[PDB]
Design a protein around this nucleic acid. Sequence first.
RNA 1: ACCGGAGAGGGAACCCACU
Lengths: 126, 171, 203, 50, 333
Amino acid sequence: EEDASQLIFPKEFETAETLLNSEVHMLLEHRKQQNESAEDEQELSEVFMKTLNYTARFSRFKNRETIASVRSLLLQKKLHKFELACLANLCPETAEESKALIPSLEGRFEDEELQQILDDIQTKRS
Amino acid sequence: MFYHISLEHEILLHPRYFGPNLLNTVKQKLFTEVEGTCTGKYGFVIAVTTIDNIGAGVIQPGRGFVLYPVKYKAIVFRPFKGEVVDAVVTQVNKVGLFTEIGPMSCFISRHSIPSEMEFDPNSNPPCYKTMDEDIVIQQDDEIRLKIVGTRVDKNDIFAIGSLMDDYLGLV
Amino acid sequence: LQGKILSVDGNKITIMPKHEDLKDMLEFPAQELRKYFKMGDHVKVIAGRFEGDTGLIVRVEENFVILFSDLTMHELKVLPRDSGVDVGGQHEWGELVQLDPQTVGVIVRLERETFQVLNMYGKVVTVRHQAVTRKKDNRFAVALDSEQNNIHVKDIVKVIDGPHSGREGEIRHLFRSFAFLHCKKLVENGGMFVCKTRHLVLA
Amino acid sequence: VRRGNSQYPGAKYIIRDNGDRIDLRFHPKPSDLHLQTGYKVERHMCDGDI
Amino acid sequence: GAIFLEGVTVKGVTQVTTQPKLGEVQQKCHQFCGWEGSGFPGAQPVSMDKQNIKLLDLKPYKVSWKADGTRYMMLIDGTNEVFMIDRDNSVFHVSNLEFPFRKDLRMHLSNTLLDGEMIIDRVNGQAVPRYLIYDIIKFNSQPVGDCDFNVRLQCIEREIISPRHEKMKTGLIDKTQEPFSVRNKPFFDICTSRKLLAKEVSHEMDGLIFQPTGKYKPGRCDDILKWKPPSLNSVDFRLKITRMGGEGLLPQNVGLLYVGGYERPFAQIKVTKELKQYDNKIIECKFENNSWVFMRQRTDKSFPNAYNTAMAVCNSISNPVTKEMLFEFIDRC
RNA sequence: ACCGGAGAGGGAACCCACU
């Protein structure tokens, strides 16, 4: 029953806030700086290292204020909360690509508005 | 997909950790227990950003241990049947291609691989390539992927992916 | 119509399915039904050469269903109610082969021109189908385990030393100081692995 | 523990953190006679016990 | 199994599996040693401890020095009959080694039994197998093992080495054709060992052996003492690197030093990632301080050594028996 | 490691007796 296309999510998992690769990197780098200082702490996990280097290589824009800007501008337009982060991670270059990647947006908004949002996304790309 | 959720857990403390710093030891115990852990229901718990609340700890009757109900914000990774995320190749093999996603590792099978991606054993690095020789899928490449199915192994999540879908390939 | 089984009888099952979008229960005889499954659900192999193995079905064909095992990603094709032999029909997966005059192994993967063979030293080698000879298996072999128990083909043993220490397996073949074992939980090499008999104990 | 079970003011078992139970009355090997702060020892009843 | 000398292959040395022959060669060794049980008849030295070093003062002792070598008794039975016996009772047949009789150089030695180590020795950058003759049990059936260790060392020189150098000077023995060099382990008295420990040999010594002057005896000899630095010093530990965090306790990873036949952790080690490579592998450890620390990993061995072995080595390392500690103890006698 | 110290040793019924 759990399908990303039809937007079924667990009730316990419904209210969670979804995240971007770049902001996940800034959080993980904050944790890394926290652990490297204040010694006599456990060594970070292989999972932590893999996620850190993954989101480093997959970081779209490094700027912190850009994260807040893109989040706010995209949420201002009425869209489902799960779609914000997946769209910003994938960064489609055409609205046809965006609808192919996420079928939910197909028919949700017109081609011109979808392409304008995508163009803003690439505009804030670093 | 990456998320920010609040979770509930209870940690037992041995009486020797009471000390003058009990809450710090509580924080350390929770970190060491739920850092890098995996649950089939909620997926990978990558890191704990903050601890929302640490409740009143109850002394177990007949046991010196004390359990604290703890509220904490953690970032989780649990993939979907139907989500699309970019992945990175780790190994080229004749059974299939090994690619790495975050903490989790998934493989694409040959029958799920489109028939255009022919095998190249004889290339010095084993490769997935077309007859037109345009698309070169090789070790350490970053690719699009469609994860269809997930499995839990020793409370750790592994998944499987599909690549038949359009536009889904090399970045 | 597809739906889930409420109850069951032995012949006319009077399977009372709850079909998708149907709140009513119908009745079907067994002969009218088959076990369907969309791709991506977990399946178990109920009976066959593969029975006990599990996997996610990637593709469904007419009556054919293909899937990847959870232990190993080695492919599987089975019937909807539920080959195992290479092209050429001479050899089949899991068989004992002679690699050269001194070395034996077990075939653990079938390819169009080659096999992957787990040799008696624990290494996997690639060989052309004709470069190995089919070896007569000694189903009545006996050896000693680490506690001097007699062990035989089909016995369940625990590994208590060596690389696979902590594992558990079924003895599939025995040769001199070597044992080829199978454990379905091991996805590597289709579940096959090799241990010294003195590193084993009868479970 | 060194006195052991034979002498009366002694112990019968010594329980370690893993839960391993060592029996003191049947030739305990001098290695596991050694004990750390986490362990429990099953001494005999003594004067002042309630 | 049977690997004659590991690290170098030796031409003409051939293990023997054929029961008619093998069975005898093993037996003629028990015979010559006056040996009781099954297995290896040869003298087994004991590790020097704070009790042991005392004997150095209770009678005369000669000292030589332990090289890492493989223990072999060489049985010289005839013209092509030459065999090696190891700690295991495994038997090898050595092919082009020839032993002339001091009297008739055309005659070959028979019913002779020697004790010694087989040692790879690199000179001129190259690995030369040597057999060091460290004792002789039997010579032409003559019960020389009953003689004085000084008599026996002299026997070896005159009855074994000297005849062969003689046949060598004449070309009738080609040092080049022979599977390995044959030599007598050199022995000196107690005082000279002191010099060994202004030591410029301070790297090259794996230890010392202290040999009493008494007649040869088989099996366990509490009066032959092997001394090895405790730093090097020294038991085979089966290690399970384990994340042992008790209930209510912060999870901790430790290395549990298991031994043979004792189901529990004998000791603990300061586990480290640079020690994580040899997970679940047999290792040697050094008990300099209260902490056992790792020198080398023994892939050849699969089982940890026994609990009684662990006890003996712990006692020995607790009472460190040094060269100066026993030098005076024998010099008093 | 040569065995691993293995001790767990039915039960129901009735009778007598103790405080």
